[PDB]
Symmetry: C3
Subunit: 597 residues, 3 copies
């Protein structure tokens, strides 16, 4: 009778409750209060309704999906994945997520509070998988949206350590899909060989998706893995903050990137990276331009800490047959980055910023401009030949450097004979501090190695802070690089003993709208007259010089060379010195040569 | 007997429980465990205690208030607003919040976990309202405090889309009141026409109030709305972080601001704004100085992303009959901001920083100083005439710009004929990079248009990075602007073809403590003597010049002009050149003119 | 029979439940659902199982420990400390935490959701204590680890106001121990006299430990307290973000620091400090080098707001008999800091950065380099004599300043007669803006007071932005300071009336690899010849000068002095001017003196 009802599954539905014995409160039943929360245990049961304990020999997938499906049908809620248990997944999902090698299908308004651990069983060894998928169709173009889905807690997603079976396979933790107001917070992703841990958005469809306070640990482990980017941000108004990324595999030093920022109004801030090849790509792929336009703008990489083996930030933009991608309005600021201990040339070329070619190697498709790199530090150990503040390997329409501290082998670099980028609006302000770790290492090398097709509307203000007499020059332009409407200066400090300071192998510093200054040694000879007397250079390669002035003391009593010099049409320098007593004088002086500055 | 007790509201109070069958655990009753949590369902009931389903025809207000009142009486706790339901509010509250058009009264230590949706019913159409109010008196001066009140969750506050009925009305989401350790986290505020979404503090009373990870979407929709600021921060030690603000209304481009920082030790960081007129005001209003003093100091606007139509940061301070407001010790850093696509003059004048007058238009009441603007980017499209790095429209006691990238029409601007601000300690360091988007657009315009009453103790170091021969000058001072104890320099790069570089329409560069340098074209003529020979300017307006030097090459073989020049009392320049052969020479040379530098 | 079972502690275990009457859901018992959560009430009971109310006369310690012990035995979970109650602790713990004066022992995977208040009873008055301890052994070297332990919520830890009984005692809130993935979030620590509130890690053992959104209020109150650092970060990959620190005690202005960053890859960001002596130490102690190596690198102090009375960031490194500590790769950025109102010399010497000696006073053990200080503001009121951008008191191997705004008494300072640091790679870029608050206060003082044993590979580019004729010099080197391979420049702006600009009391600016420039007044006299005519200095102390140029106008019609000058072997300057009419001329001119620049 009553006893039967009480012991039945409807029993709690018969036991009355009123909150805190408050006579103003609702007269409820116990079941109503229990129904305010929901866990995996409410679906983790056999066909007779008996609870099943999780474990390595139990496949929890169908139970978790049934939980998600049911809570979705009531307008959403939060399913707890209980602490103190490991929940194994041991089969693929069915329906719209099967095209994505999906395990679990996420649904709108259904949050997951992961307190325990979710592990992959060895069914997945050597196979593709995406553990949580928010697409609802195998074809992403035909997918509905995922909205208001949050995964959070103190728990763990463990990928079982399994290697990839083939390089062409894809593996992911969370693919939110066409995702609006979705987020992952607090979760540890660990122990795998995967392509991505989390992907946000799809080809610009989505908004307001975030990854916050998550850990990603040891997510590459094999030579089969083609590539890895821990978070791929493929919708606007989205980003990554306060996360921790670590790899230990040798392969990760060559293939793994922490973040991809691929749509406008996206950010990467406050995070720590160790053991990765790359920090972040900031890219507009034409192939990804469907949902949010063809421009990646308002891109922010700030206040991160990194030890990487390749490049910290990589910029790109590219084209398809019918769409052109553009990258502009970027800020890279406050980051403290180093190339980890490694041999020269043992990983991809070390760089703070890389202007990279497209995925096919094309360097003449990019449209990258209005970038600001400010207030960052970069260090590479002295042996790492392949380290640069910027490797400028594809067409650049602008990039501005102010008030950074770069301590590596090169400042600006591109390999000769390779690509010949067209460079516009490259600005290197004098407030960039050039470190001394690589002093004495630079035999045969140019600190600024301007291996470009052409440079226009650019500024390079070189300022040393210590000597490095091993370098061939501070800045060199090969004769193949056109230079125009530019300002190139070499501050004299720490340069007195340098054989070459600025080198223009095509004599490009003569251009009508080139503004330069740099130190040089010049031999002069005077006329014999007592009194005010001209001094003239012996060499005739100064027809471009607008003024010069002495950087040398005068050890003579009986005369003095000119303090300042102009030129003559034959290319000599000329200035008026003073012979206290007459005689032809011959001196070698260090001058600051100036053109239009 | 027993069956009756079990089915009664005291039934759960008779059913024993011990945690996990642990014999060391408390012998409790089921009701005790259920009493550890509380939801709206525990109060959302008719007078007989029967639960009422929420819905558009049910007014949930009295039930939610009864929940808050009761939990307050037990020392606090957290009330869940359940997921999967929309809870409508359909009447005003009563008592102390009625003076505030209040709906719900918040209470100390009573948190709200909003997982579902709270909507406004059409009772509120065309009426004022403040949805959650923490004042306890209609007169804020007579209000008690609100302490330890947190609103958080994945849920939503929806204002029903209703327009304002009259411009003089006020609408708000959360007014914490005189608020100490209060916060909103995770919540989406959307679909309204309101004055504010959240206000913190009252006239400096409050502390440690924050808005974190919230979304504000479409909160202005009509021409009736007088003004909108999404978060108003009116207590110290408080701020906004990691929020998302978006508007779509045309009206928002003219009236809406994201944040007001109005008391000391307040911050706005890490947020994204789109569609707003303004980013943040940083202001000390004398009228708001009661609870925390008359100074706004330690004000921080950092690492935000914005597309706005008017000004990004607006500074102010003002006076009342008996109190004077002061603003100092401000930092604006790491922000990436653009003026969105619009016609020139179609919204309030575009600016990165505005020094604005008080609410009555007064420009002679401000006391603003010790501000640092560093490491920001700003862009405005080329057609937007009305765009400036700084619009300096009221008295300024100091502002420092270092290492920014500004790409807009003007650097410094104020409209002539308007206000004549008194300017002190304006510092524009040479490390500020001036972009080229507006090159060729500047006919008739001065890049730095110094339309002030006076300038003192100021530094303007102009550095171009590309040519713009359309501009009238790089910097111009009208004769009405006094200039003293200042340093004004124009770097020569990209200026060779400029007719005017620096212009001093009152000849102010002659001042005893003015330090200047800029390029100019000068005609000279020599004496006929063979050998060392003087050259003299034909014009006599150089009595202020302390030295000059050549920026031009010398195309002659038979002579050379001086490399460097001094002046003479009649205002000629003079220097010593060299005539290899005699003859009177006549040349036109580009010189760098220098005074005391 | 059945009634007996129902009223027993196993009663809930007999009442059936199925979630939302879903026939696909698990057939459970009420007890199963209640067993999904756990609170202190489940252990806060007498030996017969009757619940005990908390209160000032009840010691809750044993109950909370039993809760932690039991949840640990099931693999972890989260224990709620209920809102609306104050839980008092009134005795020490036992076992491994007794060596640490421990109260509660934390355990792996057992989180604490503190919603109510935890108070200390007066048993603790005048005694040591560490409230929560994660070590499991009295000897930390023999301790196991604490993993996956999070303390969070809206609640409060209150230390009872009790003073220290003796300076040698230690008091702490949370010692996580050898701690991996542990964190504190949201908690208020208040009302004490303690050594630390939170400590992370032990001598480099630990990882991924964080303090986020916590408040620390009034944690020093007596003259007995030897020292206080609110958070001590002693494991890598760990940090402090978005916290609030306030003190009101006079003693805190002399003894209290907010944060210690003592291992690599640690951070302090986004926080607000008021009332403290110090902001953060960034230190590698050799004595703490066991778990993570001998180097502190990737150290980040960013975007903080502070009012302090001593120093903002303090750098250090030191040695033991067998280990040497090194500090490198540091970034200090975006901070807005002021010295609070106080009399000169009334608290430890005010500084933005201090290079401090070791704990024994040794200044010759440090290895600190590759530090970047950029984009910060610092202010000290005009009366505070003891205020500096950097106090450089121990050996320094490098520190770089770019684009800061420093407004205080000194730029670089060390006390004479004290330590004589060896300085390398000190870089002060010209983009640092020097404020004017202390103008007129600097009688007898040098703005840059270079009281060092030696300076090498250093750059000081002085740029004033207003006049201060009270200062003795802009930069002074005593004869005891060797100077070599350095660049020292004084911009002329605001210096015309200064008696001394740069001072080299040992004539160090003559060094072969010293690059300098600064203004000076020089008396010259010409020969009598009409026409081009030499001018020579009367004094002979210019043998080091490579060029000089006029900073003065020429008030004469009949002649002009040289615009530019070289030197002669006797130490005179010499240049060629012009006598329109003959005669011996005598002039006093302001020159820019230059050596190798
Ligand atoms: C690891 C990584 O991100 N590397 C980037 C590089 O990214 C490109 O190359 C990677 C290689 O893994 C991706 O291309 C692979 O995956 C795509 C997408 O998979 C299909 O679509 C998804 C939605 C579905 O779930 C899957 O089942 C597949 O059907 C394949 O089409 C492609 O053949 C394959 O090699 C990456 O693709 C992007 O991936 C993100 C995140 O999942 C998606 O949001 C995008 O839609 C998808 N883009 C496109 C154009 O399909 C490639 O873009 C970058 O290009 C490079 C420089 O920026 O940096 C790293 O090397
Ligand atoms: C939209 C906005 O913030 N605009 C600012 C501008 O702010 C001033 O103008 C706005 C217009 O809405 C506010 O003035 C309106 O509201 C105040 C306050 O309302 C009364 O007090 C509150 C506590 C109570 O709940 C209400 O029922 C009212 O009784 C009215 O007094 C005033 O008449 C009316 O126009 C704003 O007032 C401030 O509002 C904040 C946030 O609610 C309160 O904390 C302050 O106490 C209150 N200040 C004062 C002095 O009363 C005005 O300050 C800024 O001035 C401007 C430049 O900084 O930027 C934007 O335009
Ligand atoms: C307040 C503060 O941090 N001051 C720093 C200063 O720190 C050193 O001085 C303080 C003074 O309180 C600490 O030294 C005291 O404590 C240590 C450690 O206590 C023992 O070990 C812990 C684990 C155990 O729980 C305790 O029961 C004790 O057994 C004592 O050994 C020492 O005698 C005593 O004076 C501080 O020690 C460090 O403390 C942190 C945080 O608890 C531990 O993680 C470290 O292991 C421990 N270090 C060492 C070497 O033992 C001292 O390091 C800094 O040195 C200074 C400059 O950087 O700034 C502040 O003044
Ligand atoms: Na697919
Ligand atoms: Na730029
Ligand atoms: Na070429
Ligand atoms: Na009112
Ligand atoms: Na300033
Ligand atoms: Na005037
Ligand atoms: Na101990
Ligand atoms: Na450095
Ligand atoms: Na010495």
């Amino acid at each position: 009778q009553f006893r039967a009802i009480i012991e039945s599954p409807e029993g709690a539905g018969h036991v009355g409750y009123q909150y805190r014995r408050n006579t103003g409160s609702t007269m409820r039943m116990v079941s109503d209060v229990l129904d305010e929360r929901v866990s995996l245990w409410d679906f983790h049961c056999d066909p007779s309704g008996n609870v099943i304990q999780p474990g390595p020999n139990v496949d929890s997938r169908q139970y978790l999906q049934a939980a998600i499906d049911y809570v979705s049908s009531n307008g959403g809620g939060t399913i707890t994945i209980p602490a103190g248990y490991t929940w194994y997944l041991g089969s693929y999902g069915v329906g719209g997520i099967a095209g994505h090698s999906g395990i679990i299908q996420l649904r709108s308004n259904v949050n997951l509070n992961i307190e325990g651990r979710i592990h992959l069983s060895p069914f997945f060894d050597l196979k593709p998988f995406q553990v949580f998928v928010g697409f609802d169709n195998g074809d992403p173009a035909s997918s509905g949206n995922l909205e208001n889905c949050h995964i959070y807690g103190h728990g763990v997603v463990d990928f079982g350590g399994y290697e990839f079976g083939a390089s062409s396979q894809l593996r992911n933790g969370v693919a939110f899909g066409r995702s609006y107001n979705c987020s992952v917070t607090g979760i540890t992703f660990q122990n795998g060989d995967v392509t991505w841990a989390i992907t946000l958005g799809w080809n610009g469809y989505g908004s307001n998706c975030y990854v916050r306070k998550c850990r990603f640990i040891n997510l590459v482990n094999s030579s089969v893995n083609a590539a890895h980017s821990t978070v791929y941000v493929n919708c606007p108004y989205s980003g990554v903050e306060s996360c921790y990324f670590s790899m230990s595999s040798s392969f990760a030093r060559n293939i793994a990137c922490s973040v991809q920022l691929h749509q406008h109004d996206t950010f990467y801030r406050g995070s720590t990276v160790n053991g990765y090849c790359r920090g972040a790509y900031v890219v507009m792929h034409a192939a990804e331009a469907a949902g949010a336009g063809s421009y990646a703008y308002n891109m922010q990489v700030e206040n991160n800490i990194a030890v990487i083996y390749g490049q910290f930030v990589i910029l790109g933009s590219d084209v398809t047959a019918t769409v052109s991608g553009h990258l502009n309005d970027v800020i890279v600021s406050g980051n403290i980055v180093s190339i980890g201990e490694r041999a020269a040339f043992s990983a991809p070329f070390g760089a703070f910023i890389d202007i990279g070619p497209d995925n096919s190697g094309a360097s003449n498709v990019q449209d990258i401009q209005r970038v600001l790199v400010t207030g960052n530090s970069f260090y590479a150990p002295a042996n790492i030949t392949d380290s640069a503040a910027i490797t400028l390997r594809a067409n650049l329409n602008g990039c501005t450097f102010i008030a950074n501290n770069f301590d590596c082998r090169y400042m600006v670099y591109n390999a000769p004979g390779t690509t010949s980028p067209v460079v516009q609006n490259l600005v290197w302000d004098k407030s960039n501090v050039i470190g001394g770790t690589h002093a004495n290492q630079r035999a045969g090398q140019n600190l600024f190695d301007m291996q470009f097709a052409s440079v226009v509307n650019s500024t390079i203000e070189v300022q040393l802070s210590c000597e490095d007499l091993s370098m061939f020059s501070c800045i060199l332009f090969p004769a193949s690089c056109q230079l125009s409407y530019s300002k190139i200066t070499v501050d004299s400090a720490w340069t007195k003993s340098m054989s070459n300071t600025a080198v223009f192998e095509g004599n490009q510093q003569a251009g009508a709208n080139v503004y330069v200054s740099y130190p040089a040694t010049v031999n002069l000879t005077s006329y014999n007259t007592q009194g005010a007397v001209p001094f003239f250079s012996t060499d005739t390669n100064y027809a471009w010089v607008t003024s010069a002035y002495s950087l040398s003391i005068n050890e003579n009593l009986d005369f003095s060379p000119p303090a300042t010099y102009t030129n003559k049409a034959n290319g000599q320098l000329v200035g008026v010195g003073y012979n206290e007593i007459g005689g032809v004088r011959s001196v070698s002086v260090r001058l600051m040569l100036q053109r239009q500055v």
